[PDB]
């Protein structure tokens, strides 16, 4: 009785620790699987804001009247 | 008459009134299909560590 009193944790303490750690890891696992699905559909469809390799920007484009109208 | 136009009076960019107002897009073209979705808002803080194999905390 003294050993369980002064040297040990309660079964309810261990129990709620187990429930807390399992809720944490369930959220972690579903976020990881959701991550890889988002990533594969994003690289597939291309509409996502991640895999945008840079195209032209029109900071080097200026429309103005030329020296030949058949431009 | 017909005064000789002095050098360099065939310069001096010119206004002139017309028939039509200026047309839209004589380039037989279309607009952009879909622009970039603005991803903004208050960004969420860290979400349960790295979500790597381990190294939370």
- Oligomerization: part of a larger assembly
Instruction: Give helix % range of chain B.
Output: under 10%
Greatest interface by residues involved = A-B, 9 and 8 residues
Largest sheet of chain B: none
Largest sheet of chain A: none
**Secondary-structure-derived class of chain B:** little secondary structure
N- and C-termini, Cα separation of chain B: 94 Å
Please characterize this protein's 3D structure:
This is part of a larger assembly, with chains A (71 residues) and B (57 residues). With 71 residues, chain A is an all-alpha fold. In chain A, 56% of the residues lie in helices and 0% in strands. Chain B contains no helices and no strands. By secondary structure, chain B is mostly loops. The chains are: A mainly alpha (71), B little secondary structure (57).
What's the SSE blueprint?
This is part of a larger assembly, with chains A (71 residues) and B (57 residues).
Chain A (H helix, E strand, L loop, with lengths): L1 H5 L4 H35 L26
Chain B lengths: L57
Please give a quick description of this structure.
The PDB classes it as electron transport. Chain A is mostly helical. Chain A has helices spanning 2-6, 11-45.
Short descriptors:
part of a larger assembly, 2 chains, A: 71 residues, mainly alpha, 0% strand, rod-shaped, B: 57 residues, little secondary structure, electron transport, complex I, cellular respiration, mitochondria
